[PDB]
Amino acid sequence: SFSLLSQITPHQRCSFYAQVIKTWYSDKNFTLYVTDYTENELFFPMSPYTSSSRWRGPFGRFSIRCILWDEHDFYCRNYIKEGDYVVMKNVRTKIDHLGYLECILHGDSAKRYNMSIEKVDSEEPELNEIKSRKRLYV
DNA sequence: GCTTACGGT
Known part of the structure; x- marks a missing residue:
């Protein structure tokens, strides 16, 4: 089951559609x-x-x-681009030191958790709420 | 894993 980003909570795995605003790759990970x-x-x-x-x-x-991290880094770092749409599946969530919620795709070669991130074609009807809500916001 | 809400690698 999917969640709107409004609905997600720390230390509970979640799946959602989103648009990529920013990317940045580094020698440690891909963000x-x-x-x-x-x-x-x-x-x-x-x-x-x-x-x-x-x-x-x-x-x-x-x-x-x-x-x-890891396999998720290698897969996405030169693939997912700013402006792209994605579906992210069973990702883990946590907070940083100031209490802000973030999500994490960690190493899992056994695929225990059925984590995945994949691009969604811009015209897929699944992205329609995002596009409308952007309107509302803009 | 993570000092960052930068950069443009």
């Missing part, structure tokens, strides 16, 4: 910042004032950081 244009009280509040001008996403508590 995404994603939104479905629903607000979560535990998300980081992005400032309209100090955010990078490149930030093509919403402000306030409307996006979430996703850390991708």
